[PDB]
Amino acid sequence: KFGGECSLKHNTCTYLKGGKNHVVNCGSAANKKCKSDRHHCEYDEHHKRVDCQTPV
Numbered sequence: 001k002f003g004g005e006c007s008l009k010h011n012t013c014t015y016l017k018g019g020k021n022h023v024v025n026c027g028s029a030a031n032k033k034c035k036s037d038r039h040h041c042e043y044d045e046h047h048k049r050v051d052c053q054t055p056v
Contacts, residue, residue, distance in 0.1 A: 006034040006041035006052045013041040013050045026052035 004015030006026065011034045013024045024043060026032065027050065034041070034053040042051045
């Protein structure tokens with residue numbers, strides 16, 4: 001399984017598919033944002049969507 005990191009102020013998503021890393025922005029509205037720069041994020045490659053630290 002893949003995995004990326006999430007930023008607190010730069011709420012961004014960075015994951016690597018295979019042997020290369022990518023960069024994507026997280027559309028945080030209310031709680032879709034991040035609170036910890038070290039926190040991890042999730043990105044749907046099949047859904048072509050980016051997700052960050054959200055309440056569940």
